[PDB]
Design a protein around this nucleic acid. Sequence first.
DNA 1: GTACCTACGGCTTATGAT
DNA 2: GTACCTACGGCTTATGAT
DNA 3: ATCATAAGCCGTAG
DNA 4: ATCATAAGCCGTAG
Lengths: 508, 508, 200, 200
Amino acid sequence: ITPVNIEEELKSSYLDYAMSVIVGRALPDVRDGLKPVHRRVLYAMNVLGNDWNKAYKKSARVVGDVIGKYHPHGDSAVYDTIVRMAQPFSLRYMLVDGQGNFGSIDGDSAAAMRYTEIRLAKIAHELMADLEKETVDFVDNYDGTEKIPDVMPTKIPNLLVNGSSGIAVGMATNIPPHNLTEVINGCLAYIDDEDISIEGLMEHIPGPDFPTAAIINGRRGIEEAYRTGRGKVYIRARAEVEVDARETIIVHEIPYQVNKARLIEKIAELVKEKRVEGISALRDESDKDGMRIVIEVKRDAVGEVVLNNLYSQTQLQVSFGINMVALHHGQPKIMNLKDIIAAFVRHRREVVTRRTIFELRKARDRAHILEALAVALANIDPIIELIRHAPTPAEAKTALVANPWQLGNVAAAGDDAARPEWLEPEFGVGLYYLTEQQAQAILDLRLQKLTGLEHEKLLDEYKELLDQIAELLRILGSADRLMEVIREELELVREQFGDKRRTEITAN
Amino acid sequence: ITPVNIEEELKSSYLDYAMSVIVGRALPDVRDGLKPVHRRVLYAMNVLGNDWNKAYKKSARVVGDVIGKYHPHGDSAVYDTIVRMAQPFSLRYMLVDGQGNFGSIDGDSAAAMRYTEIRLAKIAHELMADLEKETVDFVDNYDGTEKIPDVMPTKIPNLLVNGSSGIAVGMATNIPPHNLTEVINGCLAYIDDEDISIEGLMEHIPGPDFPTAAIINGRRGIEEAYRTGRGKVYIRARAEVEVDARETIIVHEIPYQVNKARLIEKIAELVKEKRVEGISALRDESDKDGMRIVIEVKRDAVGEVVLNNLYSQTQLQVSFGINMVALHHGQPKIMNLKDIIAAFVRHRREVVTRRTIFELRKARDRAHILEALAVALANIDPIIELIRHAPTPAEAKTALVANPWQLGNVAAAGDDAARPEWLEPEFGVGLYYLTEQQAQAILDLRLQKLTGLEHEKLLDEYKELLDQIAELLRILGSADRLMEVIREELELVREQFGDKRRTEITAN
Amino acid sequence: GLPGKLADCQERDPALSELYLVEGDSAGGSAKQGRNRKNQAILPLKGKILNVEKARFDKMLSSQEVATLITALYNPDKLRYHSIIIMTDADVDGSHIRTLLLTFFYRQMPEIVERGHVYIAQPPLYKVKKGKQEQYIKDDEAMDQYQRYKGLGEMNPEQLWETTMDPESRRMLRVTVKDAIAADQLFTTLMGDAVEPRRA
Amino acid sequence: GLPGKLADCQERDPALSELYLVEGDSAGGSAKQGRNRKNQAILPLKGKILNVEKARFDKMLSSQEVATLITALYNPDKLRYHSIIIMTDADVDGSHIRTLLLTFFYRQMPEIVERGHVYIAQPPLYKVKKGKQEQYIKDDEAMDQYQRYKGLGEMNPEQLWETTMDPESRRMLRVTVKDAIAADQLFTTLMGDAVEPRRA
DNA sequence: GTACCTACGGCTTATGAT
DNA sequence: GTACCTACGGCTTATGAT
DNA sequence: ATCATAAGCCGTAG
DNA sequence: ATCATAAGCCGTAG
Ligand SMILES: O=c1ccc2ncc(=O)n3c2n1C[C@H]3CN1CCC(NCc2cc3c(cn2)OCCC3)CC1
């Protein structure tokens, strides 16, 4: 059985590959800025029950669990991703606090996956706040036997804080980091006024920020980058000339993502080839007090010309291709700053609304059960005889259902909304009726509930639930309250995890 | 600070190594015949909750869990051990039922640890029957934060059924497999009479058994092996001459642990070197109907002389060095058959006694609680008033403790032994008193327990517990009942997992 | 080359044997253990293969085991293995490596593609079991009208013989050379690759 | 040999530098990242090393990087690295590889052992933390009188500098050659090995 | 995605030497 | 116990050629 | 005196 | 005509 097939088949096959790399492998999202790998790893660490204030765990458990349940793509990629998240000098705000040999700036690879230990950091739980309260949708795993969140209920605009760098089939992306307090101030300014221009945002957000500080030369670069979506920016190391009371060059900090050993060896090679002039030797003194490279100026040289020649030919000055590309509703779109901020705020509104609805419904059901429990606690004796005479628990339940109740005067809320929706109008018309759910709730009491110290507790809980459901209905009422709440939460987040600028933008 | 040290230090260091290889790495035990690796793997698979009648699981989860919690010695060794346990042609009774590419007799290595699936087999739960009932001691893990069983509560004499092959620093061990029903018959014969000789056991147990059948030549070998502890035995392949209505050699099954491809290539080499005569070609026809190698006899040859020349020079006949060494109480000892059987029976007696004591104590405590619950269910009304008047639950408990009770005539066992040991004689002298434990047990009732359908249930449970504790005290009473129970359990095990001989021992 | 990986069959007359190509160790094991031992052959590979257009250099050669085993390369002269088949997993990387192998064959030896010797296999996609009811599903549409195997190195070898390499039940697929077009030109130019994925 | 693994120091005058020997990638990383960069040196190894007595063959040589880096081998002529130290983990394999290296030094170059150049290190064994109370424990007896590190490639490099390679706080250990005895003969003869472990 | 090097003892085969 | 080979795009440096 | 061509590196994946 | 010596392989471990 060999049916004839055209060669055009090729296209189809290849096309499929493209559609699986752009969507689910490389390009991050605009709503939370997380590749699917990071998402699944964080979700697994949370489900395993490994918070920040507990003891560490070996990498083997986490890696094996992630490979087993959620991410079926081998092991080396996952462990490399974890090691990348755990490094301090490669993310502005690290997420996975670890213990072991995670490499360093020297380019040394990390240790094996049977020595290190990992756990979440305090900022990690802010990404995953209120995950269980039905805020986002769930998607099936590879075989359709588990659930995975689609997008995280974030509180931090992660896409602007950490950025990413991925390469798809037809597209490619690259975004620099930033600072947290500045982005929060920008978001607050945008919440204050909806039709803000780019001038105000560029005034609140000066420019990028890097894990290891440096100096930035041009403003035209970042301006054209934020306004359109593409641009270049220069990164310049920090150094200075110095003479004791001959000349000497001291280097404190290098640009972003540059091997130190390769730099030293390349400079040694340049000196050996005579392509550059005025360098005698080269020494390193890096210690626990900051990085420090020393270069001895050849006698009878200004040195600053040597410095400019280095800046021209050395890795000490390197370019960076800002290019913003991400997914908006499942399609790549070049997006500027304003669009990212608007998307973040919309996501936040949606999450808050859904969480509020959920908590409202839960408190509603709880109060509904406790009403009938209080009514049953009112009349204690006739229920005792009705149960003692009824042989069958089912018949006792039915007898409790059938008759009305006296509703003692010590028992006898809002006009409405203290009762669920799917409850028909023929329950709770003092006259009162019950329901099978309420019936078994009554049948599931204890004898501790019959003292003079639980009646007041039930009354207290009932009043508290009334107040809470009233407040929730109000916060669902008008948009102004919602915006105030988002403002307060963002201000709290700002005050908790703030810090100071590291780099320094000097105008040309 | 550099204190002078002698060179003798060396010895000490090296000596330590020895003491950690003989005890905990290679040599198996006499009581269950399991290296520590197998023990920890089985315990992890049981704790993870992966029985035989459930869905499979990926190897990554199990391997990662074992490396994380119990066995800190890398990954390759553990996965190789699992693959070895999962092969059919390398164990007489496999333990880990798997799905995937576990290699074959061709010498091909198994697949990666991210494709296969594993679970326990039905015989595995017979090794670990009644593990939670406090039958064996627990030892701390590498850091002292978990627990591991020391020896398994076995029901099968595993050391004789599967055997092992390990190499220590100064010692070395090697044991052949056997058949199950024969070993069970031998154990029953030894239970019948304590002072049996080796003749009877050798009559009940003919000889070894292999996963792939073969032919064994000598009896002197296995006789000297079972009697003393050392010996050699020959293994001969199965083949025959055949002529249609020229000559041809057909081979059905090869000896134990022989690569087929290496054998074919070595025979091709021998034919090419002219060292052997009478072989023209060599073909393979192995299919799903058994292994089948065909060799074409060169014309004008008896062939049987060729067959004997092969048996002389080919791997088709191979020797085997039976040498029994194992640990008895933490020290290697060369042990014969009778000693192994005696040790197994002693272990079984100990396990049964401890399990019986545990179940007795548990049923005792249960009946003790239910007595007071029944007495409280007798008098229902005064307890209701005593609780309604008492405001504090603590004060209500104390008031329940302070006064005696009426012990209604519908309420009012053995002469004694229906009450725990640590209960003082001042409780339960109809007169009756309570205890704080009983008090809170009463305070933790429900309203379902007050119908006409739970009173009979409580009476039934009480009578049943009385009968059970009487039976357990009897089985602890005299040794004859214990021996009868062990006999019955061994007979049941025999009847469940029996099978038939594979090899065939021909006298010289 | 000839030793090491390739495990040829007993038959030597061409125009009657077969050859397969799969991922190396995960699959080749079960492939060898479940195949037939008369007129079957297996050549495992390693990972991926470099494009022929994106980097063409007659000195650029790393594996070349295919060009050593199939013929001597000048394809008309030696013509061994008159039928070759490509098996690969059903995931996306399967389709990717499939595209790479097909463009290799099309841009190195056009004749062996023209005369109809290359074949594509069709592994199943789902196994449905309702008690006794067993069912093999090969595509998405069948599953829609009605366990998921994410690699050939996951099923039992006997199942592999029953479902993929049985001369009575296998469902192969043949390739042709209909026209001389420039899709393989828009393959790697960074402009077509940027415009072609416009599937709205 | 000289490139690849060995990362020497800035000082070149002998009789002032130091050298270490550890397991390769798990440890050497932290060792380099936490050492001093003036008069320190590191030579990672790979796995285990073949015995010198059990298989002695002047042609049998696989790594030989030690014999290439330390001197030219005829040890009196070149005498570089007048002080060498052996670090290894506290588990049993540590003691095993320690015994192997010591028998190598004793049976290849007796003089470098006699003049007192070989040193043994003493890594800590436990870290006790009761709130603010920190405590380093090095042996079993101290732990008895009062986290467990099962590899040097597990602690932070700064802790390594504080506890193992600080010229003010490290507690080394020196070796001597007291007598000429035959313990290294009962090392590998299969008879002494069978009788010597009689520790009841 | 995949190949090499080591330790521990008890068995064989293979090879040139009194 | 440890090293090499591949794909995807956008940047640099390095080199011999109109 | 200017330009077409060929190499490394960044991150999830075989 | 007989013998001391040197090599592969099996399974948990660096
Ligand atoms: O394939 C090769 C070929 C050559 C080679 N040389 C050196 C080397 O180190 N390696 C070489 N290799 C490859 C690699 C060995 N490889 C084996 C598998 C291992 N996997 C680690 C692991 C996997 C899992 C773990 C833990 N650790 O737990 C969860 C389940 C899966 C990584 C190292």
